[PDB]
């Protein structure tokens, strides 16, 4: 299967998690708790307080998230859920698995939804290692 690393509103406990569990969309199975190997800026921006993984690897913070195994139906759904390619783009990155001889692999390549073109000042907004709509910043996700 394809693997998707989710860092935002699709995570367990977050406002859009349900779309992964709606079987009309295909299938998504939790595989691992993960953390990016490379840092990225993850910022809450815009009137809706959406989380954006800015495509600036090498800056920001290591980002916490969840790895899901998805079928082709669910990948096509999620591409459209994320308004690709105009808003987000589906890119790849390597994720560290968070859990003897030979030792277990500790990395896996995943797809992720990142954003390449954005207001430049967004890069100076607070950087998040773990997004939560209900987190300490107070900027609750606002789709309305």
UniProtKB/Swiss-Prot annotation:
It comes from the Eukaryota. InterPro entries: AIG2-like_dom, GGACT, GGCT-like, GGCT-like_sf. Residues 124-144 are annotated as: Disordered. The keyword Ribosomal protein does not apply. GO terms for cellular component: cytosol; extracellular exosome. It catalyses: epsilon-(gamma-L-glutamyl)-L-lysine = 5-oxo-L-proline + L-lysine. One of its GO terms (molecular function) is gamma-glutamylaminecyclotransferase activity. Keywords: Lyase. Its EC number is 4.3.2.8. Residues 126-144 have a biased composition (Basic and acidic residues). Substrate binds at residues 7-10. The active site is at residue 82. It holds the Pfam family GGACT. One of its GO terms (biological process) is modified amino acid catabolic process. Monomer. Contributes to degradation of proteins cross-linked by transglutaminases by degrading the cross-link between a lysine and a glutamic acid residue. Catalyzes the formation of 5-oxo-L-proline from L-gamma-glutamyl-L-epsilon-lysine. Inactive with L-gamma-glutamyl-alpha-amino acid substrates such as L-gamma-glutamyl-L-alpha-cysteine and L-gamma-glutamyl-L-alpha-alanine. Belongs to the gamma-glutamylcyclotransferase family. This is Gamma-glutamylaminecyclotransferase. It comes from Homo sapiens. The lineage of its organism: Eukaryota, Metazoa, Chordata, Craniata, Vertebrata.
